[PDB]
Design a protein around this ligand. Structure first.
Ligand code: ANP
Ligand code: ANP
Ligand code: ANP
Ligand code: ANP
Ligand code: ANP
Ligand code: MG
Ligand code: MG
Ligand code: MG
Ligand code: MG
Ligand code: MG
Lengths: 362, 362, 362, 362, 362
């Protein structure tokens, strides 16, 4: 029987069964609806929306970790269970995930629906970063979890999270996508459509990388070189991309490029550690775990180390952990946690919920 | 001596001397070449192309704010200086204008030519929207600059532009022209030629207006009424136009009519403001400046106010500024700026350019 | 001629002339610099930074009572004298204030600058809490002085301070501000910017209050009631705030909410008294003076009395003194002290300083 | 005019005018000086030192009947005349008192000061015990005079003192005070300060009593009973005292409790009588006069009788005289003596002194 | 079989088996409990609390030699026997230690628990100072025993303690720790946390020393010199400490620095000797034994000699004994005493106790 694990985040839905070592269904959190008049099914989800992307207007029900369009959200869950996993929801307890510091009501309504729409016998909502650490197999470390919608820092020491130093930025994969949509027009590549937004997403994933030394990377870039790469569009049009390959991901470190007043990840993580007790700090430095799909950028860990070692004390050893399959870290953690025998009492039982009411999930 | 100001945009070339309160030469950015065999001068520009429009194939060297046909572009500049303004280029520094977010290379090559072909001692390229604001005489406001080729929103606050919220659409005067060429065929008026495209341009300017309440405007239109207007073609053929008088300009607000997935101007401007800091927003709302010839449509400002006040907060005062001579706003701003004594150090000197190289203009 | 009194604290600069009953210049200790590229004056202070808050990055030169950014600090002093008070520094002796237990070097360098940059003929640095007591007009009492950067307890008996029982916490107005920036996101109000930090400051001052019975205040809060208040943002957006109105100021009493291991103010003050001689204690209890702008919270005095009477002996009369204009207490005291004829020998004369050297101020 | 009588002893200064039936000024022989840094008058005397006791370090210029700190001693005399009695010293002759067997130089210097500092026209120094007997109105009896600093036995028969049997112990009120400061820590009441020493003095005077049968008083004390008393400190702290109520005064009878090898008062007085002629003894037994403030303990006379009757012969009638106002006995005697017409030739005249020199007072 | 010796003092627990020449278990008397929410074992002792110090709130069950938190006290004893020594309590008689003049009830309850909780067949409580002398191997000397919680002087002559001259101060290692926590903020090192208190403890032990000539040590300190030392925090932050290295331990000699009215150790010890018989004094002077961990400060013995020789007579030889391993002196003495054959009758047998009752231990 076991249980279901559903990392219902922004961008991608990663779902499978608790106890498995990998998701069974990985697909976009996208709902598509016929842009053009048509009628010469007005509801496509995930891979459907992808395959018919050039007709549909693609929407993301979740933005910045927040479920905005609840109808579309429900729609996706429906597919997740009935069409993707092929499971009768009510036979399994469900583990959901959430980004720390989300609007309280987000979780409240989310779990409500699981109980009412899907008749899920029991459920639990876990903080994504916590699961990520748990996935790697550590009790101590600071988690830099950065995905499509949010970026956050959660410091955990020997099983104890330190809430007061949790950091959260809106810089994320989707912002990076849009930044390319902007700067590609410097060459003239008007990637202005939603379909093109998705194309650009593919461009990120294949061509972008993190500069180790941005200033000299730009100096290098000024000279014609290996930096220049070609890319094949769906219509056969070849795109030449150069500076943008690293100028885009650099915005994670220099947010002002996009327009954010906040500090870059380097300093954001640093500050999180600064807000923790001195006796803890050392261990956080030696256990800096990165996870989430934006950390899939080439050399992001190396650049991270470079700058955080500059920020920290010279006698402070810093180790960044880049556990491969970073992209699925949270889901993995969920699988583990749900299988854990000492986690069974953590399930909120429908009966219990019905008695207690919404508030119980917080 | 002073200087020259040249608003070399799409559709119209607006040129004159810095310090004047109006352009001296206003003519179409059109190059015409004998369509028919002929030979029973194969290069006509502006008013020439207009006067001989029924023979020539009329081309626009600039499209969507981008100089596409550089040979024809140069040709027009040649006439601008030598035949229109009657000026020996090299005696004056030249102010050029450009739509924000254009292909970097556009400006690069443009200025190259000014230095090499015309020996222009010095030059400067300014963003059109910026000049527009400057023309009205404000340091704060959001500029909705919409002309023949592009539509864009530039938010400026006390002299500081906010790049990250600049919006840009391809909806424009030329698109509107073509939309009429399409929908006039509903009655049967096959305006399919290039010559006819130009005729239709005239039709826009004289008969189109912006509906305040499109839905009831259509309901009104369903009944025979004052809406129906006659129009005289060059060959004496009378054209009857009704619904189209407002259905065409409505596409600026409902882009899907043409086929664009983007939001209408109402929401485009709104979103631009949303991306700006909350402390700024209020002033942007009370200083919404419209400029560019597409804003010459009757009641476009009133309709704009209607919808943006619907989008904004009920406690938010919104004022739309429609400074008459909107059509020449940018050029006016240029004249002012160039005359400004504290602008003289902004000129890029040929010597300086020759040393630095192309990149200096960015 | 008289003298100048300058309560150069964190958050607000309160300055005026000695002998006046109120400050002449009250403005924020803030330096603002253009966040965005700009240049489409890069130094704004106090009210300037406020008026242009949505462009500038606002920094506080002073943090936790410590002058961190000395260049910006000097900048503010410059404005204080030349633009705010309109006084030629060198014509007046200056009274400065300082929070007890500050880094020795803070005062050293501060006074150095007054002598060297501003040519101030003479000066004196007084402990803020001492002046506060002096302002109320008492020789005996314990001063709970709590402002933007620091909170401290100074026990004074018949003119004799008791150093060994001075308490000092980092809990302060600014921390409270940030706590709201955090907990408002429970509803979803992402007040994440610096501009928004300032907006939140305004929210504190208008909506926050101190719960008398926090536990039942929360129980009350659980039910929809009068607790819920609306707030108008600069962009017209209405914010609904409830629990947070008292959960924020409660952190002064339960520091762990923020993340501090220290005791709440109740016990902090109590402990200060415990460290004083038994023969003194009684009078300290009957003369508990509160001052500083954080004590402007509604009912903070009443709550204070409640808990301190619980902590103290049942036969011990406790009276909390909330002398209105608590917010300006220190400055007032300074005015009085400086006017005092028997205070004139306390001025450190530039000549004297030049001979003695820095150390003299301690 | 009359004269002044000044019982300048340890602990208390009892002064007034000769001829009065009571002292006009009764205050502590204490000089207080600001313990803490202060200066945020460094000389307080008597009631001043008491009122400001929690700041000042309280010192007793006199210890064990000996003037140790002469500067502080003079200080007190200054107040005695100028602030307390409001008398111009030089207008009156002064009667001083002294404990028998004091260091010769004590009297020498004391009287010197009266003549030189205060210009006292004439003076006389009387033995305290002698005056005490004189106060009661007897010519025969043995005087047990026991106060703050000394305890002594002076046997006088029909106006003739018997020097060779004068006894003197250092056991005294102050020692008893300190003994409580010690034994109260058995319960945990750390009365360790000087301020607390004074508090403990108050405790003595209100709660201590002399056990009649110490051994069974302890046996009684072992059972929870009426013995337990509460006491209110200046800070409202309630103190519970039991065994100590009589264990402290018992040390007068069992000096080893403190650490003295000498015999208790019972045997000390007994021995004094033993050293007197047999023909005298009987009358001494029937006239055992107790005086001095330590004899204010409840039941001390009764206990005294108990034990001295045990020590003496069974046929020997013993009567202990406890003339109420024992505490002021000496001063009273002084008043009487000074008013006595046949005492006027006993005054040492300044002229006489100036001729004779110091030695005259012995 | 032998016995167990447990020097259960404040700060450190020093335990081992009687007959051994050193403790087997030396660990902090600290109980730690998760400060932060946690649960993302709530009872850590000694080395556990140390290793997890940055999470836990560390408490000392014993303060000033008094067991305050009995539950935590018991907890530590539990670990002492079961986890540290690995001994089944009931198989051994236990020697406990206590600081002279402690609250009677402290010992009463302590021994109760040993009999009831741990079923200890027999026990004895010895005065710490006595054991210390015994450890050195002397019958005559004055013991200056100064540790984490208390400082006391016990004079013993040829096996006879002299109770009436036992001195006791609250000045101690912990007070010194806190004094650094205060004065380090003069440079700006806000060591305000409990974790930091412990860090500061380490700072004491490695950098503090006793000035021989404090006044000229300060004069020396005024000049930049070798006095300045660096220190490495757990987070790699380097701390520079100078004056504080000796200003902190100086408070043992000038208590007013902290805020105590009592005399410094120099005079405290001196006075103890003054209260002893003159025939004894000489031997006490030549046998001044120092013990307890606060006497581990560099040069404390030398400074002690300096000042006590100033206080004593010039013909009085003074020798201070600093028997290395001063820190474990008491425990050592206990081991010896317990092994002593003529000490076996001193054990209080559970049977005996059960008959007699609590009071027997006094
Ligand atoms: N292979 C890749 N290389 C670079 N970037 C990637 C890669 N894969 C994903 N990312 C991008 O960054 C985001 C990664 O998605 P993902 O980590 O699953 O976020 P999420 O956990 O699902 N959403 P959330 O945690 O709610 O913000 C997407 O926008 C991807 O475009
Ligand atoms: N009187 C008018 N009434 C309505 N529309 C007009 C009028 N005049 C111009 N427009 C139309 O809208 C466009 C206005 O031209 P114009 O503002 O000069 O654009 P531009 O600034 O020259 N080109 P650009 O800024 O590069 O997009 C032309 O297509 C005109 O047909
Ligand atoms: N009217 C108010 N109501 C509630 N809180 C206030 C009010 N006014 C000020 N405070 C807040 O608490 C702080 C008060 O400022 P203030 O007492 O002047 O501190 P300060 O004396 O200038 N700084 P310092 O003494 O150096 O910590 C600011 O953060 C205010 O937001
Ligand atoms: N009401 C009282 N009850 C018990 N003891 C008292 C009382 N009054 C005084 N004594 C105590 O015993 C001492 C009495 O003071 P007092 O008899 O005036 O001594 P003195 O004559 O002034 N000094 P001296 O004769 O020089 O030793 C003080 O220490 C008092 O605390
Ligand atoms: N190596 C050292 N150098 C300087 N000081 C030390 C050193 N070791 C210990 N002390 C300090 O002084 C105290 C010594 O501990 P310790 O002598 O064991 O006291 P204790 O006997 O256990 N407690 P107590 O006798 O009940 O007051 C601790 O606070 C230490 O920080
Ligand atoms: Mg995620
Ligand atoms: Mg234009
Ligand atoms: Mg203040
Ligand atoms: Mg007397
Ligand atoms: Mg010890």
């Amino acid at each position: 029987t076991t249980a279901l694990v559903c990392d219902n985040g922004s961008g991608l839905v990663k779902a499978g069964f608790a106890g498995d070592d990998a998701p069974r269904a990985v697909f976009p959190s996208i709902v598509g609806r016929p842009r053009h008049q048509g009628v010469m099914k007005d509801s496509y989800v995930g891979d459907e929306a992808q395959s018919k992307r050039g007709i549909l207007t693609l929407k993301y029900p979740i933005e910045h970790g927040i479920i905005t369009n609840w109808d579309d959200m429900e729609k996706i869950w429906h597919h997740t269970f009935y069409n993707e996993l092929r499971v009768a929801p009510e036979e399994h307890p469900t583990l959901l995930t959430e980004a720390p510091l989300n609007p309280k009501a987000n979780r409240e309504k989310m779990t409500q629906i699981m109980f009412e729409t899907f008749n899920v016998p029991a459920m639990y909502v876990a903080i994504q970063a916590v699961l990520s650490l748990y996935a790697s197999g550590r009790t101590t470390g600071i988690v830099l979890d950065s995905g499509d919608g949010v970026t956050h820092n959660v410091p955990i020491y020997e099983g104890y999270a330190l809430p007061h130093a949790i950091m959260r930025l809106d810089l994320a994969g989707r912002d990076l996508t849009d930044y390319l949509m902007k700067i590609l027009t410097e060459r003239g590549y008007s990637f202005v459509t939603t379909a093109e937004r998705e194309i650009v997403r593919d461009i990120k994933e294949k061509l972008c990388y993190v500069a180790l030394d941005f200033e000299n990377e730009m100096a290098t870039a000024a000279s014609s070189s290996s930096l220049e790469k070609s890319y094949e569009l769906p219509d056969g049009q070849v795109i030449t991309i150069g500076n943008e390959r690293f100028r885009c991901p650099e915005t994670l470190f220099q947010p002002s490029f996009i327009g954010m007043e906040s500090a870059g990840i380097h300093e954001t993580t640093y500050n999180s550690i600064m807000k923790c007790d001195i006796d803890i700090r050392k261990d956080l430095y030696a256990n800096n775990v990165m996870s989430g799909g934006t950390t899939m950028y080439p050399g992001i860990a190396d650049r991270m180390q470079k700058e955080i070692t500059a920020l920290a004390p010279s006698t402070m050893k810093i180790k960044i952990i880049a556990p491969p399959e970073r992209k699925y870290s949270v889901w993995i953690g969920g699988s583990i946690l749900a299988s854990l025998s000492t986690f069974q009492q953590m399930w909120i039982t429908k009966q219990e919920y019905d008695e207690a009411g919404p508030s119980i999930v917080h």
